[PDB]
RNA sequence: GGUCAAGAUGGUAAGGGCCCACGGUGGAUGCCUCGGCACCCGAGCCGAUGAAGGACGUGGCUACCUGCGAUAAGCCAGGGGGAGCCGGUAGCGGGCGUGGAUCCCUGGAUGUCCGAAUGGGGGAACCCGGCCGGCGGGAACGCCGGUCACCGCGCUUUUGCGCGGGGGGAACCUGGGGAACUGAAACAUCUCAGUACCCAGAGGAGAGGAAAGAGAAAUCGACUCCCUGAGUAGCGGCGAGCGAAAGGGGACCAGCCUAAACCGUCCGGCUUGUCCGGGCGGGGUCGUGGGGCCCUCGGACACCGAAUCCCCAGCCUAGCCGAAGCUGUUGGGAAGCAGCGCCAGAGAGGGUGAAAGCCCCGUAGGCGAAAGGUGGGGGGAUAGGUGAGGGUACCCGAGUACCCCGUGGUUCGUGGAGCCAUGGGGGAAUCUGGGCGGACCACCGCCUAAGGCUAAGUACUCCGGGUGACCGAUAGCGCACCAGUACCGUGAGGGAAAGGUGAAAAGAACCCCGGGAGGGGAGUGAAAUAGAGCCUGAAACCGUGGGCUUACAAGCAGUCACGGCCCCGCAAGGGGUUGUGGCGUGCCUAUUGAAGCAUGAGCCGGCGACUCACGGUCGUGGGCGAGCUUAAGCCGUUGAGGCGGAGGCGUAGGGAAACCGAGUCCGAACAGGGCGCAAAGUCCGCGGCCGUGGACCCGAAACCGGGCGAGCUAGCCCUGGCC
RNA sequence: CAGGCGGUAGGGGAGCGUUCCCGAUGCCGAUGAAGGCCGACCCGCGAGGCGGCUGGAGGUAAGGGAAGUGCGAAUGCCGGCAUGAGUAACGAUAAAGAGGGUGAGAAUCCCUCUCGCCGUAAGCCCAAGGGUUCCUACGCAAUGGUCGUCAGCGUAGGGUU
RNA sequence: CGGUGAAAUUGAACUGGCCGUGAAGAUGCGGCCUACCCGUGGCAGGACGAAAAGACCCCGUGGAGCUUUACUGCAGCCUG
C-alpha cells in the first residue's frame, strides 16, 4: 500500500472479509491501494433525480477498501509474489511465482 | 529486578513546597523571590577588612624554590621501602608526591619514631635527619646544576 | 338527631428550599496525529545566463492551496518504471496511454511585469525614450525582438572593446563605533564590558597561522580548539569584584614565500656616459644569509593551499530482492481463543474493520544499481620550485625602531608598571646589526621585527537524516495545516483561533407539519444518546417530571437530638426529607489585634510558582586509605564498556620571609601561640544547605540603543480660493 | 509502667496518590484499555479494592528509578456561564392617517390618495476619498440596533469605452 | 401592551429596630421590642454605596523635571 502495489485488474481472494469469494478487481489505485473487487456495495438510494431513473437509487456500489485480500492465485490461492531471474534478453517478468504460478500473461486472461 | 538502594541513599530530602497541609517556606517579606539577599556575610566582612596586615604578595608571577615536600621515614620503614636507596625518583607510590601542592619538588626527612633521618641520597633531610641517617646506616648525597 | 359555648388540631402554593429522574447550552478531556521542540551526523553558499523575494496570469468549465508564465493541470532530451494518470475536487463535460502512459531524477527552452535594475523616470510590480530587424493601413502608430546604468577594475594613449562588483542570506565570523541599568544594599573610580545595539565586509567558515616567541633547563620549538594549568600568579574607593600566561595531558601536524641593487639584461628615461624609472630574472633570507671574484662543485626520486588531469567519481532522486501457515473458532469484526504446519546473518515499526515473525510494508537480511552535478582518498602523470664548499675590503625586507607626552591592549584601574599597539614632535641602524628575559645599569641568553600565501583539527545553524526516564492539542514553534493570515496601529509594529463523523461513506432516495429551517417515520448499522461540527463528550447555568418540605416567621450556616413523612429493607435496620428544640461570627492574606465595616473572594473548568549548572558545604548510603578520574584514542541495533595516568584533594606543619621541619616563629627568650597529637581520607551517590548565575513566582517610576511617524499638532516654505 | 499527644512561623520523621524510565511488556483486554457516571467492603489519611452504568481502545506495574505535579486562592492566566433585567436603552419632538396591492407573514415593501419638515437646505454640481458597488433576476437562515416577502444584505449574470 | 434585549459590583446570604457589644460607629455575637407569603411604582439613609490597590501622607541609602557659583566631567570660549 504505497507508491508501489499488489495485483492490478487481477483476480483474487478475500481472507478476513465477509465474502472470500474472489473475483474481478475492476480498478486499483497507486497510493491509496483503493481497489474495487466488485464484491460488496449498496445503492446510495440516489438523488431522487432523473440523473438515475427519474425514480432513482444507484445500484453498482463497489469501492473496495481493506488490504487483507490474498492477491494472485495460480493453481495456488494465497501466495506472495516472486520477482525475476530474467532468463531472456531484457527480462523483468516480475510475474507471480510461488507454489502454483500466475503472471497475468498478456494472453487468454489478464 | 530487586536490589533497591540498600539503607537510605535514594532521595532523602527533596522536600517539595512547605508543609503537607499548609506551606510558605521561611520568614517575612525580607526574603522574597528576587530575594537572594545580604549573601555570605555583612558585619563578618567588616571583620574581614578589620585589620592592617603584614602579608604582602606584590606585583608579580615568578618565584624561586627550595622544594618543601613533607616525606616520612615512618611510612618508609614501617612498610613501603628499601632501607638505603629510594630517591625522589622512586617515591611515586610514596604518598609524599602523590597528592597536591608540589608532587615533584623535594622529599624531606620527617625523621620521627626510632631513628629520624634518610639513608638514601637526595635533598631534604632534617638535621635530626643527617644524624639518625648516620645512625640507621645511610649513604646520602646532594649534587646541583 | 338538632341548636349553642368552649378547646385542640388539618389539608389547601403564586414561588421558593434539600433530594432523584430525565434533557439542553459549555467543553473538561482519555486517547489520538501528515506538528513542534532537543541532541547528534549529514549538509553549507544565492545573484545580473538580472537571484533571494513578490505583482498581475493559466489550468474546458476554477475566488482559493499547487505548479508553471505567455510555448503557464506544463514542451525537450537522457537517467528511472510498472502498468495506470489529467495536482489538493471527488462534479461536470471530455481524455492519454503496455508501438516503458502517472510519475521519481539530471540536465533542457522560452522563461510576463516588479525587485540590486542600471537605457530614462517613477508614488516598484507602471508610464517614457534614442539603434538594426520585422509586420501592418506605408509616413506618423504600435507590438515581438535584439537593444543603450553606474562603479572601480587592467588592456591598444585611439576599441574606450574586453573584465570586476555590486544584490542577498536564520547563526556562526573579523574589524569598524559603541550604552544605562543591576552590583559595589548610596555612588561619582569601579560595574555589567567590549556585553546589547548602528555599521563595513571576506565565507562557507572565516580567525589566527613559521617566532625581534616562549623560558631559563646550556630547553623548547607555527597557528587554532579541548582538558589542566590556581580562580592561584594577581588587577583594585586592594572594596563588588575581576582573574592570566609557559608548561602538561589531547587533537591536529606543509610549510611556503616577495622589494629587498648586486648581477646582468633591458626599455623609458632625464639628459648621456656611470641617477631614477619600470619589465626578465639569479637574489627572489624559514630558524639567516644573498650577491660579485678565486678553487672543491654538480651528470635520475619532492610534491603543492585547487598548480593539474583521469579515474573506483560519496551522493543527488529514481532500485531490488527479500524468510514461513492455513482449518477452525467466539465475533459486524478478527491479525484474536483453539488446532495443528512455518521463518529466521532480517521479533526495529507502522500499515490490513478489536493486540500477525509466517497478513499490508521493496525494513530491519543482505544486496542495489546510472551516460549528468560534486574529490578527500589511492595512484599515476602533469613536478613551479625547490635540494652542495670554503675564500674575500662590502652593498642588498620594508617609509618611524627608537625616545618626550597624549591613549589602546594585557590578569594591570595609574602605579617602581614591562612587551605589542598608535595620536601628536623628535627622528636611524645592514648580521660588532637591532627589540626582546631583569624600571633601570653592568651580564649571559633570546629572536631575528617596520611585506606577502593557504590549507588541517574548536564555532555556527537556513536546509537533509536520524535518536529522545523531550510534548499531546490552553505544552509543545505562537504556528499540526488555505496562523505570521484574521484582526489594532500612521508607519514602525502586534499578532488569535479551529485538530478527530465512521471501520469503510453506505453520510441519508422516500413518505408525512412546515416559507424555511427543522421535526415523526423508512432505510444505515453492530451504535447514530457514532449523525456533519457530528469521538470521549464531566463541572457551571437554564430547563420537563417525581419525593420530602413551606404563610405568626427572625438564621452563613449548620448541626446534636428527636418526632412526622416517603424509600431498600428479613429484621437488624440502613437511606432522603425535614417541624420542635440546644448550642454555633463564614474562610482566606497581612495582623498586639478581625465578624469583618480591612481584605482577597463573581460561578464552573484547564493553566498557576523553591529548579538547573557548576563551585562548594555538612550530613549520611556505598568503594579502597593513598582514593578517584577529566581532554582523548579505540569497540561500539543492543550500539557492550574498556582502556586514556597533564591532575586535585590528602600524606607535618611553623613563618611576612630567609627558611626549619615534626618541629617551630618571638626571642636571648627556656615564657606564649600555630601544634605533635596521623586517630588515614579519598571517591561515587542522596540529601539539609550558600556563591554565581533572573534561583519560591508575576509586580513599578524609569535609564540606555536603534528605528517609527507634520493626513498627530505648531510652526516655517510654495501655491490657488474666500470673505 | 510510664505518658506525653492544642499548637502557624520553623526544624526532624513517616506515608499519598500523580504522568513517564526498567518496566527484566506478566501480561490485562471487544465477556473493554482509558476517562467518565453512581455505591452503607479497604485506609489512622493522601488513597484503596470491589459492585453496578458509560465508553472505544488502551493500559500497565510486583520491585525500584525519573520528575514542568497534585494547588480557594495571587482585583491571576484562557475559555465558558451567570447578574442586575426581561427594568435602562434604539442615535435627534422634521408627526403622520387611509385605500387597494404582493406576500407563508407585511406598523415597519409597492402604487395611489389625505398630511407635516426641509428649500438655502435635509439643493443639485465638481473634486476627495471609498473602492464595491450600480442595474436586472432570483433568496433571507446572518445583517440592520425586533420587524421585514426591504437593502447599500446573499447568489448569479450584465454594467462604465 | 408588543418586537428587542445589554452594562460595572459582588462569598455565599434567606440580611428589623433596638440598647449593647466587638478592632472601639454591626442585620449576621448578647439580652430584648415588632414583624406573615410575594411584587410594581416611587423616596434616597445605611450595607462605609460603586468607581480607581489616595495624586493627603509617611515611609522606599525609589524615579524623574528645573534650579543654584552642592560633587565630578562634557560642551564652547580664552589661553603658554
From Swiss-Prot, chain A:
Single biological process term from Gene Ontology: translation
GO cellular component entries: ribonucleoprotein complex; ribosome
InterPro entries, sorted: KOW, Rib_uL2_dom2, Ribosomal_uL24, Ribosomal_uL24_CS, Ribosomal_uL24_KOW, Translation_prot_SH3-like_sf
GO MF term set: rRNA binding; structural constituent of ribosome
Ribosomal protein found in the keyword field: yes
Domain of life: Bacteria
Keywords: Ribonucleoprotein, Ribosomal protein, RNA-binding, rRNA-binding
Assembly and binders: Part of the 50S ribosomal subunit.
Family: Belongs to the universal ribosomal protein uL24 family.
Function text: One of two assembly initiator proteins, it binds directly to the 5'-end of the 23S rRNA, where it nucleates assembly of the 50S subunit.
NCBIfam families: rplX_bact (TIGR01079)
Protein's name in the database: Large ribosomal subunit protein uL24
Curated annotation (Swiss-Prot), chain B:
Xref: Pfam families: Ribosomal_L27A
Gene Ontology biological-process entries: translation
Keywords: Ribonucleoprotein, Ribosomal protein, RNA-binding, rRNA-binding
An example Gene Ontology molecular-function term: structural constituent of ribosome
Coiled-coil portions: none
InterPro entries documented for this protein: Ribosomal_uL15, Ribosomal_uL15/eL18, Ribosomal_uL15/eL18_sf, Ribosomal_uL15_bac-type, Ribosomal_uL15_CS
GO cellular component: cytosolic large ribosomal subunit
Basic and acidic residues composition-biased segments: 39-48
Basic residues composition-biased segments: 25-34
Region described as Disordered: spans on this chain: 1-55
Function: Binds to the 23S rRNA.
NCBIfam families: rplO_bact
Family: Belongs to the universal ribosomal protein uL15 family.
Subunit structure: Part of the 50S ribosomal subunit.
Protein name: Large ribosomal subunit protein uL15
Annotated gene: rplO
Amino acid at each position: 500500500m504505497r507508491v508501489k502495489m499488489h495485483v492490478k485488474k487481477g483476480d483474487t481472494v478475500l481472507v478476513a472479509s465477509g465474502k472470500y469469494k474472489g473475483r474481478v478487481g475492476k480498478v486499483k489505485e497507486v497510493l491509496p491501494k483503493k481497489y474495487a473487487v466488485i464484491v460488496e456495495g449498496v445503492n446510495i438510494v440516489k438523488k431522487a433525480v432523473r440523473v438515475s431513473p427519474k425514480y432513482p437509487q444507484g445500484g453498482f456500489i463497489e469501492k473496495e477498501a481493506p488490504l487483507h485480500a490474498s492477491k494472485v492465485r495460480p493453481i495456488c490461492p494465497a501466495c506472495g509474489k516472486p520477482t525475476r531471474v530474467r532468463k531472456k534478453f531484457l527480462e523483468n517478468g516480475k510475474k507471480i511465482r510461488v507454489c502454483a504460478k500466475c503472471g497475468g500473461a498478456l494472453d487468454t486472461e489478464e | 529486578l530487586r536490589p533497591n538502594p540498600g539503607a537510605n541513599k535514594r532521595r532523602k530530602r527533596v522536600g517539595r513546597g512547605p508543609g503537607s497541609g499548609h506551606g510558605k517556606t521561611a520568614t517575612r517579606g525580607h526574603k522574597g523571590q528576587k530575594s537572594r539577599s545580604g549573601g555570605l556575610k555583612d558585619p563578618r566582612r567588616f571583620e574581614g577588612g578589620r585589620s592592617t596586615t603584614l602579608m604582602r604578595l606584590p606585583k608579580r608571577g615568578m618565584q624561586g624554590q627550595v622544594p618543601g615536600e613533607i616525606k616520612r621515614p615512618r611510612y618508609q620503614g614501617v612498610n613501603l621501602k628499601d632501607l638505603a636507596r629510594f630517591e625522589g625518583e622512586v617515591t611515586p607510590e610514596l604518598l609524599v608526591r602523590a597528592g597536591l601542592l608540589k608532587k615533584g619538588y623535594r622529599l624531606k626527612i620527617l625523621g620521627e619514631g626510632e631513628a629520624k633521618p634518610l639513608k638514601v641520597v637526595a635533598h631534604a633531610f632534617s638535621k635530626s635527619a643527617l644524624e639518625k641517617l648516620k645512625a640507621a646506616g645511610g649513604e646520602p648525597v646532594l649534587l646541583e646544576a
